[PDB]
TrEMBL record, chain A:
The chain holds residues 2 to 121 of 372 of the full protein. This is Putative tail protein. It comes from the Viruses.
UniProtKB/TrEMBL annotation, chains B, C:
The chain holds residues 159 to 210 of 367 of the full protein. It comes from the Viruses. This is Major capsid protein.
Length: 120, 52, 52
């Protein structure tokens, strides 16, 4: 994912899930501040997000909260953790319909991001 | 003595610059071998336009 | 002499404006050829509506 290729977050996450569906996996929880631009209306990503080949992520909680929600409405988690938990859902067979980012205000360490999930 | 060259790797977004600066200070401290206390932060770093 | 034109490329989000402003500064600092020290910060930039 090359830097500043997508003019907003909505079009960024549209091809982030598509890349994950294609077998591409990402991990940036250690250098999170270097890849997320501030404000969701800024071009995404701030810097190029490299691919990884050793993606082995097993979270300590049930990532699919309901059958149609990644987190309970109002749950706050680290922004880098949102992408990992989202990637966990696509791997296990859940499809992403809409990523909830309309009224969100923060991208850095903690953000209230959510996704509406679907089968297949 | 072998010349010390520090590759900052500023192109990628996950290069720990703190580690490279610490390498510079540690090399200026250990390799002096003057028998006195060395302040590795007392250096001149002259760079060109591209590196800056 | 040859006229200098600086393309800011404001449409491209990846273009770094700091480099272009630095080029504008260094052109006035280098091409002055006045023989004295030159401060390039005083450049009186006048800009059209769309550029602004």
């Amino acid at each position: 994912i090359k830097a500043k290729t997508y003019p907003d977050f909505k079009e960024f996450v549209k091809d982030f899930v598509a890349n994950v569906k294609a077998g591409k996996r990402y991990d940036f929880r250690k250098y999170q501040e270097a890849v997320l631009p501030l404000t969701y209306s800024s071009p995404w990503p701030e810097s190029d997000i490299p691919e990884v080949t050793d993606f082995n992520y097993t979270p300590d909680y049930t990532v699919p909260f309901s059958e149609e929600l990644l987190y309970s409405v109002g749950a706050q988690m680290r922004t880098a953790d949102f992408f990992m938990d989202l990637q966990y859902a696509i791997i296990n067979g859940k499809d992403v319909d809409t990523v909830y980012c309309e009224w969100l205000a923060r991208v850095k360490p903690f953000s209230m991001l959510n996704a509406k999930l679907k089968d297949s | 003595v072998t010349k010390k060259t520090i590759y900052f790797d500023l192109d990628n977004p996950n290069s720990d610059i703190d580690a490279h600066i610490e390498d510079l200070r540690m090399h200026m401290e250990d390799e002096a071998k003057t028998g006195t206390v060395i302040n590795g932060e007392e250096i001149h770093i002259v760079v060109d336009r591209t590196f800056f």
